[PDB]
């Protein structure tokens, strides 16, 4: 299993994989109970009022002001039972993802994608960037710094606004310079989205109530794919967008979708990014990798004592798949770079995960959500690692009946309709 231990929210802290921690949000905060579910990966069963000190208010704004696709509930994830269920739900989804070859590949890439040690001012020393770490309270009450790659945390005010967040740098654009940075994914396994089986209906803002439910494993995988891009510092600048001209409703509103999102979805959506620009990005990141290789060449000493210089240089040799000549200098091989870049951007996509999970899912990112449902994937009678909602040897096994909210209605409670509100 990906998660060797079946944590319970109330398990006593041990200061190792169950502990009170603080994140480097450049601000003050009371420690929060966190769980380390796998090497380099932690889960914080709390609403995220930490990564952005300006988004610490969960209370729903006036009914008069609150956009279309959004859902508020200041009380969600405030009780120990909810946190216990949250932990178990997130764990189950990691197992579902890991149970597929594609998921195993993605999670392996994520664990190997340690954020680069480029926090030093002297080019002759390798130093970690502290915002790619968390402070763990040890048994003696003292804090120790631990590097990590990924944190799954509850959503902020808008419960369904799932996304990847990471701490920036005063000068370096860590998610776009090949360095990478610790990724915090706002996510909840307790809700999901409703979509429509007919493409003409799903991509229309005035039609459909959301007959089918999105499998939460796909939603989490989508965020993990973004995390992968960001951990390897190859995310596409959000200002690079596609002026949607394939959907009259998007067009009439001049809506634009970032290339990063189209890439992440994959399939035909990825084709909206022309060859000219794809080549531009590819060369840009190849050069960034070259800079990382040269920085490693100049590294003559290492700061700290958490690992040897040789160990860390090797850690990044494996991450970026660099080559090493007779002398001992690192270089970026074109074939190896293209292979890794392609793996992270074309192999790891939402569309491919749908193929592996054998689930029904939106056929494109360019659609309109229909509704949000409350769900509970923890009980095996409701959802499993192997089949999600479409439980084998039951009436829900075929035709995605488990995702059909009308057939499997006991597993979904519609909380809000979005159709007609755009």
């Amino acid at each position: 299993p990906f998660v060797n231990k079946q944590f319970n929210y109330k398990d006593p802290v041990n200061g190792v994989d169950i502990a009170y921690i603080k994140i480097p949000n450049a601000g003050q905060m009371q420690p929060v109970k966190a769980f380390k579910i796998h090497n380099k990966i932690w889960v914080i069963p709390e609403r995220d009022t930490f990564t952005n000190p300006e988004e610490g208010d969960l209370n729903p704004p006036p009914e008069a002001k609150q956009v279309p696709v959004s859902y508020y509930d200041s009380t969600y994830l405030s009780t120990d039972n909810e946190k216990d269920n949250y932990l178990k739900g997130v764990t189950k989804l990691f197992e579902r993802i890991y149970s597929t070859d594609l998921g195993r590949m993605l999670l392996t890439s994520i664990v190997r994608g340690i954020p680069f040690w480029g926090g030093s001012t002297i080019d002759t020393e390798l130093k970690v960037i502290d915002t790619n770490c968390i402070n763990v309270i040890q048994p003696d009450g003292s804090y120790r710094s631990e590097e990590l790659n990924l944190v799954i945390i509850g959503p902020s005010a808008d419960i369904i606004q799932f996304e990847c967040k990471s701490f920036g740098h005063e000068v370096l654009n860590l998610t776009r310079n090949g360095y990478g940075s610790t990724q915090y994914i706002r996510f909840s396994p307790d809700f999901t989205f409703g979509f429509e089986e007919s493409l003409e209906v799903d991509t229309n803002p005035l039609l459909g109530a959301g007959k089918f439910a999105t499998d939460p494993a796909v939603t989490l995988a989508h965020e993990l794919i973004h995390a992968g891009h960001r951990l390897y510092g190859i995310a596409i600048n959000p200002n690079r967008v596609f002026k949607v001209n394939t959907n009259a409703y998007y067009e009439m509103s001049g809506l634009e979708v970032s290339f990063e999102e189209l890439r992440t979805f994959g399939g035909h959506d990825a084709k909206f990014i022309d060859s000219l620009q794809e080549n531009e990005f590819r060369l840009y990141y190849y050069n960034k990798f070259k800079d990382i290789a040269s920085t490693l060449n100049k590294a003559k000493s290492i700061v700290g004592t958490t690992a040897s210089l040789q160990y860390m240089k090797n850690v990044f040799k494996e991450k970026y798949l660099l080559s090493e000549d007779t002398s001992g200098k690192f270089s970026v091989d074109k074939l190896k770079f293209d292979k890794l870049y392609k793996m992270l951007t074309e192999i790891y996509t939402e569309d491919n995960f749908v193929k592996f999970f054998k689930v029904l899912n939106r056929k494109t990112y360019l659609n309109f959500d229909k509704a949000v449902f409350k769900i509970n994937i923890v009980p095996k009678v409701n959802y499993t690692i192997y089949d999600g909602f479409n439980l084998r040897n039951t009436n829900l096994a075929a035709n995605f009946n488990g995702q059909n909210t009308e057939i499997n209605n006991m597993n979904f409670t519609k909380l809000k309709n979005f159709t007609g509100l755009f």
Partner: peptide
């Protein structure tokens, strides 16, 4: 992110 999910989008529209």
């Amino acid at each position: 992110r999910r989008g529209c």
